Structures are given as C-alpha cells and as structure tokens.
Amino acid sequence: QKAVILDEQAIRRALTRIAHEMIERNKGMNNCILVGIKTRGIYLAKRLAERIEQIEGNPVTVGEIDITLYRDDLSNDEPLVKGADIPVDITDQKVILVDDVLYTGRTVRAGMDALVDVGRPSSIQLAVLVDRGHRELPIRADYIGKNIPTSKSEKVMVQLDEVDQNDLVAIYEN
Amino acid sequence: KAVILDEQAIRRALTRIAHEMIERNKGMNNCILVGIKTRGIYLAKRLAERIEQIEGNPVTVGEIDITLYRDDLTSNDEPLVKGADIPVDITDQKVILVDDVLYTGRTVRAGMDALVDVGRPSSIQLAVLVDRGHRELPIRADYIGKNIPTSKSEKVMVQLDEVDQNDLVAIYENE
Amino acid sequence: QKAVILDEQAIRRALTRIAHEMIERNKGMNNCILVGIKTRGIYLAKRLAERIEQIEGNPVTVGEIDITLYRDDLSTSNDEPLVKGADIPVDITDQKVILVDDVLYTGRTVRAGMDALVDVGRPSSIQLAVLVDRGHRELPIRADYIGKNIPTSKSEKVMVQLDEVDQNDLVAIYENE
Amino acid sequence: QKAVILDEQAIRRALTRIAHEMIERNKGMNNCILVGIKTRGIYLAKRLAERIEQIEGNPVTVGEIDITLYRDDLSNDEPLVKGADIPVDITDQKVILVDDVLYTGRTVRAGMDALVDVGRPSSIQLAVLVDRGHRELPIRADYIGKNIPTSKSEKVMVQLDEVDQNDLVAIYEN
Ligand SMILES: Nc1nc2c(ncn2[C@@H]2O[C@H](COP(=O)(O)O)[C@@H](O)[C@H]2O)c(=O)[nH]1
Ligand SMILES: Nc1nc2c(ncn2[C@@H]2O[C@H](COP(=O)(O)O)[C@@H](O)[C@H]2O)c(=O)[nH]1
Ligand SMILES: Nc1nc2c(ncn2[C@@H]2O[C@H](COP(=O)(O)O)[C@@H](O)[C@H]2O)c(=O)[nH]1
Numbered sequence: 001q002k003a004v005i006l007d008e009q010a011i012r013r014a015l016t017r018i019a020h021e022m023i024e025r026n027k028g029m030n031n032c033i034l035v036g037i038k039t040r041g042i043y044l045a046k047r048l049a050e051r052i053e054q055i056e057g058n059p060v061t062v063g064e065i066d067i068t069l070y071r072d073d074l075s076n077d078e079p080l081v082k083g084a085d086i087p088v089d090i091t092d093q094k095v096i097l098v099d100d101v102l103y104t105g106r107t108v109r110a111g112m113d114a115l116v117d118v119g120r121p122s123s124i125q126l127a128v129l130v131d132r133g134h135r136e137l138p139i140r141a142d143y144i145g146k147n148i149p150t151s152k153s154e155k156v157m158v159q160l161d162e163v164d165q166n167d168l169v170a171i172y173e174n
Numbered sequence: 175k176a177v178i179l180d181e182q183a184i185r186r187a188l189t190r191i192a193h194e195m196i197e198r199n200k201g202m203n204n205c206i207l208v209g210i211k212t213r214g215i216y217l218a219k220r221l222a223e224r225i226e227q228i229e230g231n232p233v234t235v236g237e238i239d240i241t242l243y244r245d246d247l248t249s250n251d252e253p254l255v256k257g258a259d260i261p262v263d264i265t266d267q268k269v270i271l272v273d274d275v276l277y278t279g280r281t282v283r284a285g286m287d288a289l290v291d292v293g294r295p296s297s298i299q300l301a302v303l304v305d306r307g308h309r310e311l312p313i314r315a316d317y318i319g320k321n322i323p324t325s326k327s328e329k330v331m332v333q334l335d336e337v338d339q340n341d342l343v344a345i346y347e348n349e
Numbered sequence: 350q351k352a353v354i355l356d357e358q359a360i361r362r363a364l365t366r367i368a369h370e371m372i373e374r375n376k377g378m379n380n381c382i383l384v385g386i387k388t389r390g391i392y393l394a395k396r397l398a399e400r401i402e403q404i405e406g407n408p409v410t411v412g413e414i415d416i417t418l419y420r421d422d423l424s425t426s427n428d429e430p431l432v433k434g435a436d437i438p439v440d441i442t443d444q445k446v447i448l449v450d451d452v453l454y455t456g457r458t459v460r461a462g463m464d465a466l467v468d469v470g471r472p473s474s475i476q477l478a479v480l481v482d483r484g485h486r487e488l489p490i491r492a493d494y495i496g497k498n499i500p501t502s503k504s505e506k507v508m509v510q511l512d513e514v515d516q517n518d519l520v521a522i523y524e525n526e
Numbered sequence: 527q528k529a530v531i532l533d534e535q536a537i538r539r540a541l542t543r544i545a546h547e548m549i550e551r552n553k554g555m556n557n558c559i560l561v562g563i564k565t566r567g568i569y570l571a572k573r574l575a576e577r578i579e580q581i582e583g584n585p586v587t588v589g590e591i592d593i594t595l596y597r598d599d600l601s602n603d604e605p606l607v608k609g610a611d612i613p614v615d616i617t618d619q620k621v622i623l624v625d626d627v628l629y630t631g632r633t634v635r636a637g638m639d640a641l642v643d644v645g646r647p648s649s650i651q652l653a654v655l656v657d658r659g660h661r662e663l664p665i666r667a668d669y670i671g672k673n674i675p676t677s678k679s680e681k682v683m684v685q686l687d688e689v690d691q692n693d694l695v696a697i698y699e700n
C-alpha cells in the first residue's frame with residue numbers, strides 16, 4: 001500500500017509552475033544553467049529546460065551531477081560526488097540544482113560543495129519536486145513542487161516516465 | 175523610495191500566479207475570481223485572460239467595491255462594502271479574492287464577509303500583487319506577487335496600465 | 350493506534366515559547382487581551398496569561414468566546430460555526446486582542462470569532478495563537494503563533510488533552526473511526 | 527540612517543524568544559552546542575547560552591569559528607575559515623551555528639563545511655539576529671531574530687554592547 005500524492009497531471013502542473021517561477025526570479029533564464037542530480041533529477045531538469053525553451057524561446061543548458069551514498073558501515077551515510085558533466089563554463093553564471101526529493105539536505109550540500117569548489121557561479125539555487133522535511137542541515141529548496149509531510153519510517157516514491165514508465169509521486173512504508 | 179517591480183516583473187509575477195492557481199485548484203473549473211476595488215478588478219481580469227490562454231476555458235470574474243468610512247477623533251477608518259457584482263452563483267464554488275496590496279487585512283475581511291452574503295462558497299482564497307506586512311487581523315494571502323515588509327511610515331504605490339497608464343510598484347516615505 | 354506528537358513537556362515548552370513571541374511582537378503585553386475560544390482555548394489562554402504575568406510582572410486580562418456548530422443546508426452542506434456567547438471583562442476598543450484556540454483547521458471558527466470581536470468593539474488588532482495548525486484552510490486565515498504544525502491526512506485528526514479539561518496534557522494524531 | 531530596525535529592547539526580546547525556540551525544537555538542548563561566527567556571532571552565541579541555562583537549568587557549550595574574507599581583486603569575494611575553537615567532541619551532536627547577519631549565505635557555507643568535514647554532527651542548524659535576503663546559495667536560518675529584505679545598495683549595521691557599547695540593528699545606504 002501507498003498513498004498517491006501526485007499523479008501525472010499534478011506533476012506536469014507543478015513543473016510548469018516551477019518553470020514560470022524560475023523565469024520570474026531570475027528575470028528571464030539568460031545565463032542560467034540547470035544541473036540535475038542523479039538519474040531522476042536529470043530527467044526533471046530536462047523537463048524544466050524544455051518548458052523554459054518553449055516559454056522564452058532560448059535553449060537552457062542542462063548539466064548532470066552523480067552522487068552516491070557511501071557507508072561506514074563499521075551510522076552516518078555520506079553522499080559523495082561520483083562525477084559531474086556540465087557542458088559550459090559556470091563561472092559568474094546562475095546554477096539551479098534539480099532533484100526529485102529533498103530530505104536531510106546532505107545530497108544537495110555535496111552537490112553545492114562540488115559546484116562551488118570547481119567553478120565560481122554567481123549563485124546556486126535548488127529546485128525539487130518534493131520536499132519531505134526532516135532537514136539536518138540549513139538547506140532549503142528555492143522551488144518546490146510539493147511539500148509532503150512524512151514520518152522517518154516513511155519513504156517517498158517518485159516515478160518518472162523516462163526512468164520508471166509512470167509519472168507518480170506516492171508515499172510508502174519502508 | 176525604491177522601485178520594487180517594473181512592468182516586466184509585474185507581468186512575470188502574474189503569469190506565475192496564474193500557473194499557481196491552475197496547479198492548486200487542479201484546473202480552474204468551478205473557480206471564480208473576484209477583484210476588490212478598481213485595481214484588484216483589473217488584476218483579476220489579467221489573471222483570468224492568462225488562465226483562459228493556458229487552459230482554454232474562460233474564468234468568471236466578479237467585482238466587489240469597498241469604500242473607506244471615517245470617524246472624528248494613522249488609524250480607525252473602516253472599509254465597508256458598497257457593491258458587489260458577481261455574475262454566477264458562488265455556492266459550493268471556490269472563490270479567489272484579488273487585490274493589489276495586502277496591508278492591515280481589513281479590506282479583505284470586509285470582502286470575505288460580503289461573499290458570504292451572496293453564496294456559501296466551498297472556499298475563499300486570496301491573491302495579492304504585494305504583501306506589505308503589518309497585518310492587524312489573522313489574514314494571509316495564498317498567492318503573492320512580492321512579499322515586501324514595510325514600515326508604518328512608508329506607503330506602496332501600485333500603478334497599473336488600465337488605470338494609471340503605467341505598470342509599477344514602488345515604495346515611498348509616508349512621512 | 351495514535352502517534353504522540355507532543356507530551357506534557359513539549360506542550361509546556363511550546364506555550365512558553367509562544368508567550369515570549371507574544372511579548373516580542375507586541376513589544377510588551379500592555380494593552381493586550383487574550384480571548385480563548387471554547388473550552389480548551391480558554392484554558393490555553395489562561396496558561397499563556399499566567400506565563401506572561403510571570404515574565405513581565407503585570408496581569409493579562411483573559412476573556413472567553415463560545416462557538417458552536419450549526420448545520421444543515423438541507424439539500425448536507427458545510428457546517429457553520431456561530432458565536433453563542435462572549436465574556437470579555439474589559440473594553441477592547443483600541444486594544445490588541447489575541448484569540449487563542451487549540452486547533453486551526455478550515456479557519457471558519459476563527460472567522461466567526463474575529464467577525465464578532467470586530468463588530469462589537471474596535472480593537473487595534475486581532476492576532477491568533479493556536480496550539481496546533483492542522484492545515485486544510487478554506488479561508489485566507491493564518492495563526493500568528495503556532496505551537497506545532499501537524500498536517501493531517503483525510504482520515505486523521507488531532508487529539509488535544511489538557512490537564513484542566515482532560516486530566517492529562519498530550520497532543521496526538523489519530524485515525525478517526 | 528536609512529532605518530533602525532531593532533533597538534536594544536527588541537534585541538533582548540528576539541534573543542529570549544530564540545532561546546525558547548531552541549529549547550523547544552531540540553527538546554531541551556542536551557547534546558546541543560552553539561558555535562558563534564566571528565566576533566559578533568560569538569557574543570550572540572554567548573547571550574543565547576546564558577539564557578538557555580537560565581530557562582531549564584542545563585549548561586550549553588559555546589564554540590567559535592573565525593572566518594575571513596579573501597578577495598581576488600581590489601564582486602566575488604570568498605570567506606575562508608581562519609580558525610575554530612570547538613571545546614567538545616561534536617560527533618553525533620547537534621550543532622547550532624550563530625551569526626549576526628545572513629546575506630549571501632557564503633559565510634555559513636564555509637562554517638558548515640568546516641564542521642561537517644571535521645566532526646560528524648548529527649545535525650547543523652543556523653540562528654541569526656537578521657536575515658537581509660539576497661541569498662546566493664540554498665541556505666536558510668532555522669532561527670531568525672528579524673527577517674529584513676534589503677537592496678544590494680544598503681548595509682545592515684549590527685551593534686552589540688560587548689563590542690560597540692550599544693545594542694542596535696539599523697539599515698544604512700552604502
Ligand atoms: N524517491 C525518494 N528519494 C529519496 C527519499 N529520501 C531521499 N531520497 C533521495 O536522496 C536524496 C535526498 O536525500 P537527502 O540527501 O536530502 O537526505 C535525493 O537524491 C533523493 O533521490 C525518498 O523518501 N524518496
Ligand atoms: N496602492 C496602495 N494601496 C494600499 C496600500 N496600503 C493599503 N492599500 C489599499 O488599501 C487596501 C488594503 O489595505 P488594508 O485594508 O489591507 O489595510 C487595498 O485595497 C489597497 O488598494 C499601499 O500601501 N498602497
Ligand atoms: N530594505 C529596507 N527595509 C525597510 C526600510 N524601512 C523599513 N523596512 C522594512 O519594514 C520593516 C519596518 O517595520 P517597522 O518596525 O518599521 O514597523 C523592517 O523590519 C524592514 O523589513 C528600509 O529603509 N529599507
């Protein structure tokens with residue numbers, strides 16, 4: 001069992017709204033790059049970029065960051081960057097990280113630290129489809145599809161058509 | 175004096191708000207916009223046109239007019255409804271009130287009451303271009319163009335093309 | 350079957366924090382009156398008043414509002430809270446009034462309370478403190494002071510127990526039925 | 527000058543309220559340490575620690591992080607950690623960073639990086655007296671004395687008695 005929170009239509013409308021928020025807050029998307037985290041983040045980033053191209057008429061560059069969980073186990077797991085593929089110079093550019101779910105914030109901090117270390121973007125923003133709460137760092141998403149309250153024993157399933165052959169956000173037990 | 179939104183920023187805020195309204199109401203079926211006073215009504219019409227463009231269905235726009243009444247002896251004026259024109263039945267429908275500036279919240283409270291003498295809507299939401307803070311009632315906007323905390327000794331000037339021949343939001347010293 | 354969200358200590362901490370937020374935002378609680386809604390709101394208001402008296406050294410006046418649900422459109426359609434009585438022992442004109450309730454949900458109860466106060470007096474402002482905000486607002490109303498956000502799903506509600514009313518202090522979420 | 531925002535009394539009330547928030551959210555402040563950034567942050571952390579102990583009778587440890595702005599030209603400056611004095615093991619502990627003003631977020635990110643790398647706290651929170659907006663990273667304060675959006679062309683003056691012989695927060699055109 002699992003409670004469906006967003007269906008395909010609700011995902012589409014949240015992403016469309018997010019695109020218009022990005023255009024609003026960046027005053028056009030000139031000099032902005034989207035960088036998706038991991039598989040689902042990258043597909044979200046591509047969906048946003050296509051939407052923005054359609055709205056403004058200019059392409060938006062999309063990069064990728066890969067992040068993987070390392071364990072003791074010996075426990076605090078640690079996400080570490082395994083690779084980045086960003087096809088343009090980010091220095092003095094606005095970078096928007098994109099991910100499916102925000103939870104502790106540790107994945108984004110790794111992504112942020114990587115970008116800040118390797119380039120000097122003028123700013124880094126964050127867009128997520130879901131914020132599930134329970135942050136363990138002072139990190140917040142600038143753009144949020146849906147706030148989904150959860151308990152620690154719950155997990156959010158994000159399905160995307162490209163990866164999963166369904167567009168759906170649902171909450172489930174472990 | 176600061177300019178806070180220029181014409182382009184106003185347009186992008188209203189476009190975003192339209193998409194927010196479609197999102198949260200899951201399509202703007204069974205949802206009506208009601209504008210407060212002159213500028214709110216024009217903002218409501220702008221939002222309605224945008225929504226029609228996005229979803230392909232018209233959205234009904236109503237109007238509420240609200241006048242300030244005053245007593246003798248900074249404060250104590252009371253906004254009262256002086257007319258409403260809502261062209262459809264609002265009972266069991268979602269209504270979104272629309273205004274330019276949220277300040278004390280007293281004007282919205284007068285509008286919220288009025289709505290309830292014309293239908294029992296299933297819910298009432300509020301969209302404003304600017305929230306300037308200093309609420310005197312527990313009222314909040316659900317959709318906000320720009321959140322702009324101000325001092326009591328400041329004022330927000332909202333100009334709209336339909337009324338003022340220019341689109342702008344700026345803050346100036348009340349003094 | 351319920352999850353305890355706040356125990357007696359966490360309720361005390363939230364209310365203590367709320368008292369300090371009130372003092373901060375009102376820059377002292379001079380010319381402020383607390384008005385509790387229904388039974389549990391009133392007891393919360395009294396607790397908050399006692400705390401504020403302790404912090405600032407001056408008593409805070411507490412009033413009461415009673416509010417009851419009426420039905421039926423007779424077609425079922427949404428119930429309407431109406432004010433049944435109010436006991437406010439001082440003049441509120443030009444005073445700050447803080448409404449106090451246990452749980453904020455649609456906002457309709459507070460709108461009735463607010464409409465009443467604004468009608469019969471002309472306070473300089475009205476604020477709202479609640480122990481719990483459960484979400485699902487149907488009106489543009491928010492609490493100024495909030496003990497705990499406890500979002501509820503469709504089948505859930507929030508149980509609030511207070512020592513004065515329930516012989517125990519606890520906030521828990523439960524499945525209705 | 528352009529505006530006062532907090533006088534002494536307001537600073538005292540905001541810090542008292544913050545202390546109560548910290549007791550509430552951390553359920554007492556057991557296994558929680560405050561770390562002040564730079565001179566003014568450290569004085570704020572000390573005021574908060576003293577208040578917290580008075581409320582429930584439990585002492586709070588205060589550490590210090592020093593952070594200096596490095597420049598590449600004589601507006602992309604970089605705050606770097608110059609020193610830290612953390613007097614207890616922070617592994618599996620909650621840490622609260624404390625500063626006077628949050629602006630771009632880059633100072634906090636440097637401080638965070640300094641903690642997260644050199645201890646493994648269970649979480650890191652942030653308390654500030656003023657949030658002045660214009661963030662350039664997805665960083666937010668958990669505790670805020672006063673939320674004060676500003677233009678890039680104004681500065682926030684924070685005066686604290688320990689240093690400045692006056693308590694005040696004000697905005698200045700600069
Ligand atoms: N689908 C899903 N991903 C999660 C969930 N919690 C964490 N994640 C994954 O882990 C990262 C977020 O976790 P955090 O690092 O913020 O704790 C994201 O890359 C996300 O894909 C969840 O509840 N559901
Ligand atoms: N244009 C402008 N209108 C204001 C301002 N403050 C209040 N108002 C107007 O008065 C109403 C809101 O004031 P409130 O009733 O919320 O105090 C709105 O209808 C708005 O048009 C302001 O600072 N600028
Ligand atoms: N950026 C900026 N904000 C101001 C100025 N004056 C007032 N404000 C904003 O409005 C609030 C004023 O609230 P007051 O305490 O004056 O009622 C401040 O907290 C701040 O957020 C100003 O000169 N510049």
Ligand SMILES: Nc1nc2c(ncn2[C@@H]2O[C@H](COP(=O)(O)O)[C@@H](O)[C@H]2O)c(=O)[nH]1
Nearest residue numbers: 452453454455456457458459506507508509
């Ligand atoms: N104990 C409790 N009371 C509730 C709950 N939901 C609504 N209420 C009660 O109903 C009123 C608020 O409901 P509203 O009018 O905001 O929909 C309050 O007076 C409160 O006592 C809940 O989940 N638990």
Ligand SMILES: Nc1nc2c(ncn2[C@@H]2O[C@H](COP(=O)(O)O)[C@@H](O)[C@H]2O)c(=O)[nH]1
Nearest residue numbers: 626627628629630631632633681682683684
């Ligand atoms: N007093 C003051 N300090 C500031 C201001 N802007 C940044 N800072 C200092 O710089 C840090 C925050 O800047 P950030 O790194 O967030 O851009 C804090 O350590 C703070 O003391 C300001 O406007 N006034």
Ligand SMILES: Nc1nc2c(ncn2[C@@H]2O[C@H](COP(=O)(O)O)[C@@H](O)[C@H]2O)c(=O)[nH]1
Nearest residue numbers: 175176178322323324325345675676677678
């Ligand atoms: N109240 C007030 N806020 C200001 C003033 N100047 C700037 N701000 C705040 O700072 C924000 C950003 O300023 P901007 O970066 O757009 O110049 C404005 O949206 C506004 O909230 C001012 O003179 N008074």
